[PDB]
């Protein structure tokens with residue numbers, strides 16, 4: 001289909017169109033991407049992702065069209081630790097994408113260690129909300145929590161300083177305009193605090209015509225819950 | 241998801257979210273539900289169906305919500321003869337539905353012979369555009385071409401006389417309002433000729449909470465092409 005749209009105001013346990021990978025699962029009408037014990041407390045060494053089952057037609061060679069899409073979502077992070085890790089990411093990848101081996105911790109369940117910074121060995125666009133930046137293990141990160149736009153590499157092509165707020169929902173709007181090729185990100189907390197970051201990228205030189213969209217999160221030695229609370233998505237093919 | 245929508249202005253050959261059953265295939269940017277030979281001519285004894293891969297949340301027992309849906313599509317029938325058969329139908333059924341054994345010809349690929357008229361033995365709602373009504377084989381049909389609403393039976397609960405026009409596209413709008421429980425069908429040819437039929441039905445007592453939507457068509461001894469040209473669908477769970 002040229003246009004596809006779906007909305008999850010909440011996430012009831014009875015799901016049919018979501019592909020669950022790793023430790024991801026539904027709990028309390030929300031998606032817990034990373035594993036939690038019986039009490040709902042976060043544990044270390046966990047990775048989880050979800051993908052919408054239907055494939056998205058991102059662009060079309062034959063007609064020279066590229067999709068205009070928008071993804072609105074909200075999540076919250078919780079951790080008794082002063083350094084909760086590792087972060088959550090909204091991503092776009094080939095339909096057959098699976099959790100790479102050894103992609104836990106700072107790799108956010110998105111990249112394999114050997115090629116994490118090799119933009120030539122990956123096909124993925126992601127918006128990360130990174131909370132762990134220890135310069136000795138996450139050598140590619142700026143030295144502070146950040147929102148980053150990732151294009152085939154865990155080393156963000158762009159980051160902006162971000163404030164992690166325990167237990168507070170962050171509302172995010174990610175949009176792509178094929179005319180300008182601008183990928184825009186706008187995130188806000190309930191008190192009006194706002195973050196914005198934009199990047200110009202030709203998606204058809206990075207991703208295949210058909211893709212799947214979803215979220216990924218992970219925790220290595222340090223941990224925190226990565227709770228996806230709501231999500232709506234829409235995409236339509238436009239001439240360019 | 242509480243809401244889902246998709247639109248196929250046309251049907252390019254590289255499809256990812258369509259389940260093809262029987263002889264259904266893509267040709268000339270359209271979906272040919274029934275088989276055709278090398279030169280695009282309809283053949284006898286053929287059945288085919290397509291369903292969208294993503295499951296539709298028609299109703300939710302916990303929240304007491306029922307979905308409002310709208311399906312818009314256009315199709316054309318072509319036949320060298322004059323009494324082309326058997327018809328095309330838009331339908332809603334459980335997710336695992338498949339072509340029943342011996343559901344060819346007049347059964348439109350939707351019902352099994354032995355239970356075609358047993359309401360308590362089926363789970364399907366369909367809007368049929370029936371062009372063949374010979375009383376010896378299609379004993380359940382009115383004695384003229386017709387559009388009908390089928391609820392768990394090949395014997396429509398409501399029909400309206402219809403005019404089959406070889407090679408002309410019929411634009412169809414099917415809507416279901418949970419508030420009134422009215423399933424409305426409006427079909428029109430380009431010249432404005434309009435046909436309408438509706439019926440009150442509580443989907444909760446006929447179908448499971450999650451379903452799949454698609455089209456079915458068949459030709460028995462008499463034949464005609466059943467060309468699905470475009471299709472858009474949208475559903476939203478609502479509180480009545």
Ligand SMILES: OC[C@H]1O[C@H](O[C@@H]2[C@H](O)[C@@H](OC[C@H]3O[C@@H](O)[C@@H](O)[C@@H](O)[C@@H]3O)O[C@H](CO[C@H]3O[C@H](CO)[C@@H](O)[C@H](O)[C@@H]3O[C@H]3O[C@H](CO)[C@@H](O)[C@H](O)[C@@H]3O)[C@H]2O)[C@@H](O)[C@@H](O)[C@@H]1O
Nearest residue numbers: 045083085086104105106107132134136137219220221222
């Ligand atoms: O250096 C000060 C920082 O310490 C803490 O962070 C550490 C640090 O970045 C580094 O330390 C290595 C070793 O240091 C020793 O002194 C001991 O503390 C050892 O226990 C420690 O291993 O690496 C630590 C491990 O990094 C993993 O976890 C982080 C956070 O979750 C991830 O971002 C990394 O990618 C990495 O995960 C990978 O390894 C995991 C197993 O080790 C595995 O489970 C994952 O799948 C993934 O492969 C790190 O904890 C911390 O207190 C900082 O705040 C402080 O600045």
Ligand SMILES: [Ca+2]
Nearest residue numbers: 106130132138
């Ligand atoms: Ca990091």
Ligand SMILES: [Ca+2]
Nearest residue numbers: 346370372378
């Ligand atoms: Ca008939």
Ligand SMILES: [Mn+2]
Nearest residue numbers: 130141148156
């Ligand atoms: Mn980062």
Ligand SMILES: [Mn+2]
Nearest residue numbers: 370381388396
């Ligand atoms: Mn009939």
